[PDB]
């Protein structure tokens, strides 16, 4: 175990996570916002960060805070 390791309101912060063929892939974006009642309509496309050779099955997730 412990087989892999790496080291690198005002905002809406947006992320995407997906897994394909045992690779795992991440995208994100960050912006100021006018109002906080609901997600604001418009465009600001997300862009890639990391692509990891994990070789693992993912079916569940949780937020850490």
């Amino acid at each position: 175990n412990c087989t892999f390791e790496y080291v690198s309101f005002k905002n809406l912060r947006e992320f995407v996570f997906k897994n394909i063929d045992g690779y795992f892939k991440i995208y994100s974006k960050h912006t100021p916002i006018n109002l906080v009642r609901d997600l604001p309509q418009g465009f600001s496309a997300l862009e890639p960060l990391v692509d990891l050779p994990i070789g693992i099955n993912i079916t569940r997730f949780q937020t850490l805070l």
Partner: protein, 50 residues
């Protein structure tokens, strides 16, 4: 006997899938529930290279 292969699994691997799980496989009517027997098998086996 240090080298091993999986002789039994529930379903075939996806591309580059890897699986360390050791639980007893069931091949028929017998409720195996953690032990070997008729249609009940330990999933990892050795080539015994000589």
């Amino acid at each position: 006997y240090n080298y091993l292969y999986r002789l039994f699994r529930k379903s075939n691997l996806k591309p580059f899938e890897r699986d360390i799980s050791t639980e007893i496989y069931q091949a028929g009517s017998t409720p195996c529930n953690g032990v070997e027997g008729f249609n009940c098998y330990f999933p990892l086996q050795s080539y015994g290279f000589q």
